[PDB]
Write an enzyme that holds these catalytic residues in place. Structure first.
Site: not given
Ligand SMILES: Nc1ncnc2c1ncn2[C@@H]1O[C@H](COP(=O)(O)O)[C@@H](O)[C@H]1O
Ligand SMILES: Nc1ncnc2c1ncn2[C@@H]1O[C@H](COP(=O)(O)O)[C@@H](O)[C@H]1O
Ligand SMILES: OC[C@H]1O[C@](O)(CO)[C@@H](O)[C@@H]1O
Ligand SMILES: OC[C@H]1O[C@](O)(CO)[C@@H](O)[C@@H]1O
Lengths: 124, 124
Positions: A83, A96
């Site tokens: 995201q 991440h």
């Protein structure tokens, strides 16, 4: 701990892999068993901020971690998702990848966390 | 066309980037404007099947494409996701990353497809 993930330190006890440029950790609140995170060691906020080498490493590491969690946690597939940005849902401002083991038809203590990270360190 | 994506050929007209090891294409049915795909040129079914170099390239390419589509299609974030395996929802058996431009509060002809791919080829 010795790993930086946004604005909080992650204890090594919950980190089960670490490379030249990235690291993998288990979650406090996995969405699915084996839900783990692969982050660049350098805390950058958006994906475009990573140098190409961090990018190759981020994902070669994600490839290894996925194999391991799919195996250990008994999944038959894997969902990978990043995201990237506040409008994409990023809560922590650190690039991440979410790695989630998938299987047909589908909070814990620091100790449950380190128990699981210990287990995962074995596959490496 | 000259690009293989699972069991169907993709016409170059809808491909807007191609590297040593990967390629990017626009969709017939974007989920969100600018929804594009970055695939390894070699048709492998699962992510673990890619060699490390294909992995670095797959994602360095995805990094470039995301910047471009976020820009062109006016998004403020990006969602990246790879449905790796049948239990993860993979419909086409070819590793591929979904790149979707995200913005606050959120079928076409081969010609609309090639018009958009033409536009995107400009940013490279
Ligand atoms: N300090 C932390 N330790 C472990 N998992 C974390 C930490 N901060 C955030 N997360 C998890 O990482 C993701 C970020 O959102 C969710 O899966 C969070 O619960
Ligand atoms: N031959 C094709 N040309 C363009 N987009 C495709 C093709 N096959 C599948 N897709 C799209 O790629 C994704 C695969 O599912 C969806 O976004 C599909 O609509
Ligand atoms: O949590 C995943 C792990 O737990 C078990 O289902 C029971 O201990 C294992 O065999 C597997 O590796
Ligand atoms: O579809 C995205 C493109 O379309 C417009 O909104 C109108 O042509 C552009 O300025 C943008 O680049």
């Amino acid at each position: 701990m010795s790993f930086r993930f946004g604005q909080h330190l992650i204890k090594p006890s919950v980190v089960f892999l670490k490379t030249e440029l990235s690291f993998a950790l288990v979650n406090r609140k996995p969405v699915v068993p084996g839900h783990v995170l692969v982050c660049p060691l350098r805390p950058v906020e958006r994906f475009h901020d990573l140098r190409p080498d961090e990018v190759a490493d981020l994902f070669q590491t994600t490839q290894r971690v996925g194999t391991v969690v799919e195996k250990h946690f008994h999944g038959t597939s894997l969902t990978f998702s990043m995201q990237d940005g506040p409008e994409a849902g990023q809560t922590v401002k650190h690039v991440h990848v979410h790695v989630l083991p998938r299987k047909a038809g589908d909070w814990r203590s620091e100790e449950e966390m380190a128990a699981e990270a210990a287990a995962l360190r074995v596959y490496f």
